[PDB]
Amino acid sequence: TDLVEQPAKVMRIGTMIKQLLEEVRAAPLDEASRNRLRDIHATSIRELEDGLAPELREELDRLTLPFNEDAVPSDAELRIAQAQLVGWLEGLFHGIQTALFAQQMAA
Amino acid sequence: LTDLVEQPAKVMRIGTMIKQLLEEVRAAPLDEASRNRLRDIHATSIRELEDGLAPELREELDRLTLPFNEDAVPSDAELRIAQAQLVGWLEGLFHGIQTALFAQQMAARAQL
Amino acid sequence: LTDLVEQPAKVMRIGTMIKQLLEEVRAAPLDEASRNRLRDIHATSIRELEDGLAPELREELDRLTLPFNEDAVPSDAELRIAQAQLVGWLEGLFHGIQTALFAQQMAAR
Amino acid sequence: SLTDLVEQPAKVMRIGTMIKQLLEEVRAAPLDEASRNRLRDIHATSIRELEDGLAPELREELDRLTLPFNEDAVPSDAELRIAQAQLVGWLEGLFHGIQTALFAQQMAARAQL
Amino acid sequence: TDLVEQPAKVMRIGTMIKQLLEEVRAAPLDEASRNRLRDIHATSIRELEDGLAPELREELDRLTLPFNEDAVPSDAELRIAQAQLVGWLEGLFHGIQTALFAQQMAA
Amino acid sequence: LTDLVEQPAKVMRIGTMIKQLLEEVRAAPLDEASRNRLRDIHATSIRELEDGLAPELREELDRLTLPFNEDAVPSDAELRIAQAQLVGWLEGLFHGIQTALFAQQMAARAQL
Amino acid sequence: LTDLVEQPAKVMRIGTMIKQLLEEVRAAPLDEASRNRLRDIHATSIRELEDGLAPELREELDRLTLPFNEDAVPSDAELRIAQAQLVGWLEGLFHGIQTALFAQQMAAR
Amino acid sequence: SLTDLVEQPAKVMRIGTMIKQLLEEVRAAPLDEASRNRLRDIHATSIRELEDGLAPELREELDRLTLPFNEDAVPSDAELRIAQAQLVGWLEGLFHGIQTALFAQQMAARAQL
Amino acid sequence: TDLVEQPAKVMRIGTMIKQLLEEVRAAPLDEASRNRLRDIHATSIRELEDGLAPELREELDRLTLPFNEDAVPSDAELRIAQAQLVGWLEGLFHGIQTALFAQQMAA
Amino acid sequence: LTDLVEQPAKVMRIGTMIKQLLEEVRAAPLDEASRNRLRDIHATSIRELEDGLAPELREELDRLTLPFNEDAVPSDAELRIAQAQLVGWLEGLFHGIQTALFAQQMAARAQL
Amino acid sequence: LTDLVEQPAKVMRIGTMIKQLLEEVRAAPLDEASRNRLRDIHATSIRELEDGLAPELREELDRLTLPFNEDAVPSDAELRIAQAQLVGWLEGLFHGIQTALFAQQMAAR
Amino acid sequence: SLTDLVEQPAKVMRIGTMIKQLLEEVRAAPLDEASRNRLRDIHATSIRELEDGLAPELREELDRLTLPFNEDAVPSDAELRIAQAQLVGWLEGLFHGIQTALFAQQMAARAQL
Known part of the structure; x- marks a missing residue:
């Protein structure tokens, strides 16, 4: 369990990503929303990194x-x-x- | 902790409001005015959540x-x-x- | 603090009324007169809800x-x-x- | 108490069931003019009968x-x-x-038991 | 129970009306059958009245x-x-x- | 009473006959001759029911x-x-x- | 008075025969020869039923x-x-x- | 008794199952002339075999x-x-x-028990 | 049980026939496969005869x-x-x- | 007997192979080469079954x-x-x- | 004679691999490159299976x-x-x- | 033993779940060029990470x-x-x-119990 330093945080970022993923498969997207979505992907990987052990x-x-x-x-x-x-x-x-x-x- | 949500009832309430609105947008297409209103709701609802969460959140x-x-x-x-x-x-x-x-x-x- | 909802029965019935109307709007398209009517209901029902809630809510x-x-x-x-x-x-x-x-x-x- | 908010529960319940059944009927198929007038008048009289069975506050x-x-x-x-x-x-x-x-x-x- | 003077009668008239109602929603009707049906509605209200208390x-x-x-x-x-x-x-x-x-x- | 149906078996029998015929008419459209026959059946079947019911009915x-x-x-x-x-x-x-x-x-x- | 059906087995099998034929007629349209055949079956089967019932029935x-x-x-x-x-x-x-x-x-x- | 109305129950049951299966097959798809002749002849012989297994009254x-x-x-x-x-x-x-x-x-x- | 002399054999021939029958109702057949299939019907009746009592x-x-x-x-x-x-x-x-x-x- | 299948595992194995192939042919139409191959499989698979069955079979x-x-x-x-x-x-x-x-x-x- | 499958784990995983690929081929049509790839996989996977079976099998x-x-x-x-x-x-x-x-x-x- | 064939089970399982989810995504809808390149590279790096977590024989x-x-x-x-x-x-x-x-x-x- 020493691989995930902040399990609550990683779980909620993951739930956010999974929910967004369900949305992209829901309908096609326009330019602006795909802009927001690349950006959210960037920031959410940063947040995950904060919550993981170094090797991960x-x-x-x-x-x-x-x-x-x-x-x-x-x-x-x-x-x-x-x-x-x-x-x-x-x-x-x-x-x-x-x-x-x-x-x-x-x- | 569970002490990260300073006002849990309020955050649950804003959250179910937002989930219900998301279900409505997925229900049918929207027009100009309803999209504008929904933008404003998004803004104020993030402000209310801020009120109900610990600083880290x-x-x-x-x-x-x-x-x-x-x-x-x-x-x-x-x-x-x-x-x-x-x-x-x-x-x-x-x-x-x-x-x-x-x-x-x-x-x-x-402990029992 | 269940004291946040001062009149629970009233808030519950206003809530069921609004929910039932929402189901009606999603049921079929509306005309001018019915959309004005529903606008008015939305206003008055917000006022009744206010009557039944604690000040902060x-x-x-x-x-x-x-x-x-x-x-x-x-x-x-x-x-x-x-x-x-x-x-x-x-x-x-x-x-x-x-x-x-x-x-x-x-x-x- | 709260049950004293509804002075005549039998009457209020049956008026309510009447209105529910007609709502389902209107959503069943489109209506003509005469049906819409009957239905408006039913709406009026049913609000009056319902009033008779509720407390003043309601x-x-x-x-x-x-x-x-x-x-x-x-x-x-x-x-x-x-x-x-x-x-x-x-x-x-x-x-x-x-x-x-x-x-x-x-x-x-x-x-209390 | 003192509101319904003859419960058996009111129940069967009601079952008749409900069954006829199921029939009208079954298919469109012609002139003659709608003639019979207004008439049946009239007579069935009379029969119900017979079986109810005065206030009802x-x-x-x-x-x-x-x-x-x-x-x-x-x-x-x-x-x-x-x-x-x-x-x-x-x-x-x-x-x-x-x-x-x-x-x-x-x- | 239950004594309103003087011949209960007979009334049940006419009734299921009529219900079965109603199901047939709802099954498919009918022609001239079958509608005439069905009219006649309706007549005689009300007569049989009359035989099996109390005067009030x-x-x-x-x-x-x-x-x-x-x-x-x-x-x-x-x-x-x-x-x-x-x-x-x-x-x-x-x-x-x-x-x-x-x-x-x-x-x-x-009473037990 | 179960004595109204004098031969229950016979009435039951005639009944199942007729029911099965009814399912066949509702299954598909028929031609002249089959409709005459079924007419004849209806006649004879009513006669067998008569044989198996009490007089009043x-x-x-x-x-x-x-x-x-x-x-x-x-x-x-x-x-x-x-x-x-x-x-x-x-x-x-x-x-x-x-x-x-x-x-x-x-x-x- | 009533079971003595069917003299050979095994035979009658199998002839019956044969006829049932062919009925289902005919309703499965339309038939040609040769199939209709085979099926008529099967009908004939199966009525004769069935007769063999029943009491005279049946x-x-x-x-x-x-x-x-x-x-x-x-x-x-x-x-x-x-x-x-x-x-x-x-x-x-x-x-x-x-x-x-x-x-x-x-x-x-x-x-009796 | 004295009517079926070799029950195992009759059961398997029957299972073969039933399986083939399921196949013909599966799709239309060509000349050659219907040739094979008449022939199989012939030989399978012979095999069944081997496994049945004389009266059957x-x-x-x-x-x-x-x-x-x-x-x-x-x-x-x-x-x-x-x-x-x-x-x-x-x-x-x-x-x-x-x-x-x-x-x-x-x- | 059960002694009619001299090698029961082998016969079960050839059999499930053939059943799986039948399911594939019913799955979609085939071309020249795959039909030829499937013919050859049919031949060799009957030979293997022969190896695994009693003479009568x-x-x-x-x-x-x-x-x-x-x-x-x-x-x-x-x-x-x-x-x-x-x-x-x-x-x-x-x-x-x-x-x-x-x-x-x-x-x-x-016997117990 | 469970000794017919000398390495059961290996045979099982090769088997699951092949089954999963079969589901992929039935999923959609393929192009040249993918059909060559799958041809190669079929060859090598038969060789791994051989490695894991008794000689007679x-x-x-x-x-x-x-x-x-x-x-x-x-x-x-x-x-x-x-x-x-x-x-x-x-x-x-x-x-x-x-x-x-x-x-x-x-x-x- | 056989569990010593997989040296790092946590890592192998998560790489495996990653690949499974992407497979389902590819079958979800057709892809463009850029997605196909990302997906090829993911395939490469994921094979390397998977190698790291298995015994030499595997x-x-x-x-x-x-x-x-x-x-x-x-x-x-x-x-x-x-x-x-x-x-x-x-x-x-x-x-x-x-x-x-x-x-x-x-x-x-x-x-042994």
Whole structure:
């Protein structure tokens, strides 16, 4: 559990990303909303980094490449980036949950 | 702590208001006036949440949210993103405070 | 502080009235006369709600709602936004007093 | 108490069920002129009968919330659906009110046991 | 229960009206069947009156206005009139049933 | 009483016959001959019911039902109304006699 | 008086035969030859039913049914009416003897 | 008794199941001439085999109820569906008959206990 | 049970026929597959005969007429022939099963 | 006996292979090469089954199955028939060996 | 003789890989590059399976499978056949060792 | 043992869940060029991270089974779906393997009781 330094924060950022991801698959987006959405992706990765152990900051950094800060990504590109985050986070927490369940069994 | 939400009832109330409005925007297309009104609601509702959260969460929410351009009317898409961001963030916030409360129930189950 | 809702029965019935109207607006398109009627109902029902709430929640509601422009007839969308705002805000209010009350039931249990 | 807010519960409940059934009927299919007049008049008389069965405070609350129809014009399907939908919701709330009352008596009258 | 003098009769007239109402919503009607149907509405209100206490005869009378006996009403008008009766009757009997249930609890 | 149906088996039998025929008319459109036949069935079936009911119900049913014009063929709609009237009236009649029978079962539950 | 149905097995199987044919007529349109065939079956099956019933129910059935005009071939509709009449009348007959018999089971219980 | 009305129950049941399955097959899709002839002949032989397995009274009842097909013409999908549907219903009733019989023995043979 | 001399064999031939019957109702067939299918019907009746008592060999023979060995039958004709077999077999086994169940009750 | 399947695991394995392939042919239309391959699979798979069955079943299966023409490519229909024949025959074969096994379980239930 | 599958974990994961790919081919049409890729995967995965099986089952598999013609790119259909062959053969293999193992569980019970 | 085939189970599981979610996303809707490049690169880096968390034998098995993408061309929706589908299936099998392992320990550690 020592991999996730602030579990509450990482959980809520993840829930935000998953909810936004549900929205992009809801309908096509226009220029401005995809602008907001690249920006939100940037800031939300920063917040996640704050809440993770160093090796995971660096793992996530190896797996994710940022968006062109001057260019507007497509619905597809946004959907890939956010789907990656959501999947990585859910795997992270099935990890900490098989751990917690292991402790439940130890006691 | 659960002490991060200084006024939990208020934050729950703003949150369900926003979730209900998001469901309405996903219900049918909107016109000029209703989009403008909905922008204004988004602004004041982030202000109320700020009132109801600990400083760390005021400044986190502030880092994650960008206000709308006050001279232009946002699109249906832009509004859905803004409010969806809020809704997801809040639902995560309360799965947090609920992991805390449930931990307390199990501690008191425990010492017996 | 369940003392935030001073007249719970009244607030509940106004809430059910507004919710039922919202379902009607989403049911079918409206004409001028019915949209004016519903505008008027929105105004008076906000006033009844104010009557039934503690001052701080009256003032919160006031910060959250802008009345309608009486120089125009609002669109179905604008009405749907206003009433949806009310409905969600009310349901959140009662999930609050409900988690509180159930907590008291546990205190007594 | 709160049950003394509704002076004649049997009457209020049956008027309410009448209005609910007609609301469902109006949403069932479009209406003609004659049906819209009958339905407006039913709306009027049913508000009067409902008034008869409520406490003064709810008589005047309902009055503050309801506006009569224009009698020189025949209202549209839209106005009628609004009028009756308002009634249905207001009554539904009224009875979750008295319903929380009766349940409250049930809880007191086991609490003493 | 003193409001409904002959409960069996009122129940069967009501079941007749409700069944006819289901039929009008089943398909559009022609002239002759709408003629029969206004007439049945008239006679069935008479029969109901026979089975109700005076104040309810008068209440129902205040709420219902008869059809033009020389003119043929539309499917819509018939459907309104009969829906009114059905709703009023069902409310009447949820009344007598909350009463009977109250007696069940008293004993 | 339950003594209002002098021959209960017979009335149940005419009733299910009529209900089955109503279901057939709602099944598909009819032609000249089948509408005529169905008119005749309606007539004789009201006569059989009269045989099986107490006088008060003979005369009530008579007040509620109008016979068909014997020289003209009724429409599909007119037939559905006539038979639907009968079916609803009968179903109400037997929820009556069943409220009686059930009352009897509870009385005998009771004195024990 | 379960003695109204003198041969219950026979009446039951004729009843199931007629019901199954009714389902076939509602299944698809028919031609002349099959509609004549079904007309003939209707006649003979009414005669077998008569054989299996008490006199008063034979005479009731007779009052309720008019035979087919043999100078024409009936339409699918006319056949459907006649057989539906039989089926409903039979099902009512057996809900009668069934409420009676179950009542006897209770008398013995 | 009533079970002695069906002299060979195994045979009657299997002929019956055969006819039921073909009825379902005919309603499955339209048929050609050759299939209609095979199916008419199956109808004939199956009535004869069925006769072999029933009491005389039911042999003659079935005969009063069934007419053979016209052998100089090939019957239509319609006539065949009628013929086999008649058989299926008649047999279904026959076995609710013997079924009420067996259940009757079950009730006697607990009644004495 | 003395009517079915080799129950395992008759059961598997029957399962084969039923499975093939499901296939013909699956899609229309071409010339060659209907050729194979008449032939399979012939040989499968032979195999069934091997597994049945004489009176049933003769009963089945009375009820079934073979295909023209030089002509190709239609999807419909094949479907009739195989549906007959399937139905006859299922009836045969509801027979032997009501028998076996009867023995279960005897003991 | 259950001793008619000399190698039961092998026959089950060939059988599920064939059933899976039948499901694929019913999934979508096939081209030249895939039909040819599937013909070859049918041939070798009957050979493997022969290896795994008692002589009586080798010769029965041989009486019931006709090989494909080795110079021509069978149609989608012809392949579905061939494999459906196999699948049905095998499923019947194992409801047989299962009626045997279940009989054994009941015998051992029995002598106790 | 559970000793027929020498490395059960490896055979199981290769099996799940192939099954998942089969679902992908049935999901949508493919282009040249992806059909060549899947051809290559089919070859190497047969080799890994061989590594994990007893000799007689290697040789059985070899009798049952013909490799792909590398002079052409196979069609979606041909790939679907080859992989379906593998999947069915594998599922049958494991229903075998599973009925055996469950039988042992009963021997010990 | 078999659980020692996966040296870092937490890491391998989360990389696997990441790849599964992206596979579902690609099948959700068609992709553009930029998305296909991001997705190819994600495929590369995720294979490297996955390697880090497996035993050498599975590192080299996975390598025998996977071919990198052509870096001078951008792969199609088809190639990407194949590549990631292969990964997903291979990992799913890997974990039913270690899953049968853990369950095996559960059975030994009641067997001695």
